[PDB]
Every structure is written in C-alpha cells, then in structure tokens.
Amino acid sequence: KIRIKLRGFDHKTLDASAQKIVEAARRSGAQVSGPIPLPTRVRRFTVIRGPFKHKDSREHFELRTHNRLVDIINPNRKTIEQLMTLDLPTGVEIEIKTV
Template sequence: MTMQKIRVKLKSFDHRLLDQSSLEIVNTVQRTRARIAGPVPLPTRIEKFTVLRSTFVSKDSRDQFEMRTHSRLIDILDPTEDTIDALMKLQLPAGVAVDIKS
C-alpha cells in the first residue's frame, strides 16, 4: 500500500501571521481525520542590504536594512478527499505564501 503525502510550505515576513496560518491548516486537517506532521519551523532567511546615506559624499555614513523570511513546513499524511476539499476552501490571510506539493 502506497502512502500519499501532501507537503505544504508556508512563507511570510511576519512570524505571527505565519503561526496563525499554520494553526488554521493543522486544525482543518485534524477535523478531517488525516494524519499530520508539523508545523516544522525552517531556518529564517535573512537578506541584508547596505546603502549609502548620502547621495554624494561621506562613504563612512551608511544604513543597513534586513529582510527576514520565515518558513514553516507541514506534511499531511494519507489525505482524504475531505481533507483536500477543506484545504481548497481555506482562506489564509494576505502576506502568507503557500506552496503545495504532493
């Protein structure tokens, strides 16, 4: 017997929004009686940018900015048709990117 698996990967700049979305997915999957593994927090991707404050002189004066991308991984094991239907109807907040692979 082959085991089916759906892998859901969530990404967001706001970790609170990400945790809320992953909790919604976990609750939805548990209501449909499918097994679930996760949410697993993946490493945070940090992009740093350094720019000059002045447009002309003073290279010693710089600003640094960073962009943090938080990620979570959720595996849904042995999904049923009800699970897939419930996930399709689920409304997640704006600002959360969802990547689904089977």
C-alpha cells in the same frame, strides 16, 4: 505523502495560519506533521547615511521572509475540501508538492 511549504513575509500571520490549518487537518482527517520552522529566509542590504559623499557613517537594512513546512498522511475528502479553499493568507503564498 502531502508536502506543503509555507512562503511568507511575517512570522505573525505565518504561524497564525499554521495553527488553524494543521488543526483543521487534524480535524477533518488524522495525523498532521506539525508546522516545522524552515530556516527563515533573510536578505542583506547596506546603504549609507545621506546622498552626499561620506562612505562611512551608514544605516544597514535587511529583508525578512519566512519559510515553514506542514505534512499529512491521508488525502481525506474532507481535508482536501477544507484545507483547499478555506484560506486567507493575504500576504503569504505556499507550495503544494508530492513525495
């Protein structure tokens, strides 16, 4: 009944978070819905080579943002406790939503 969404910038510390977090929940609680890979959010950018009038010959670039999902079943005191504060996502934010 707990629905947590992972909003990040890099898949690296993204899944690195997902590992311990889910396990720590499996630790201080019970069953945890494994870190589902929500379709990675990527944006499109298309600039050109230089400033001087050229239209053709270019370089393309693209935004890399990552989305995931984690759920559990019980609101254990110990789960709530640990999986609350015990965090260091540095450059990743998340969303707590209910169901």
